[PDB]
Write the structure tokens for this entry.
Amino acid sequence: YVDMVVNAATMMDKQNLGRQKIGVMRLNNTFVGDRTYNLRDQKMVIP
Amino acid sequence: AAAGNIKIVAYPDTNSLLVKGTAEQVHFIEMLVKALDVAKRHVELS
Amino acid sequence: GIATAIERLLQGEEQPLGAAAGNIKIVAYPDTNSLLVKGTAEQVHFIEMLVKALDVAKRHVELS
């Protein structure tokens, strides 16, 4: 009984690679990509 | 895997992100995006 | 376009996509408006399911 409990206790611990996956996440309340504006000579870019 | 092999590419033609990684890293970025995606309010300055 | 966005997604990418994710070649063929994907039989089906999610009909906006 002891040899059953020990061997069935160390074999549930070992019991208890990853494929790649592409996800598409649509944004409803913002913009992807940068915004650009000018102050009379110079360009400002917001990430 | 690591945090350095996740690829994120903007696809502006349908306004969406493209994330490539494992099944646990894709769910990790999807929970971050839904916290940065909120509706804004309007301010009129006079 | 769509052929530059997926080409930058699979760039480098020593990742076990199901060989690797870095040996997939994607080339735009504009003469019949279609993509050319070269890979294994499991990576070709993997890009075909992504393309059908990015291919939707658009709506028209008139700004006055």
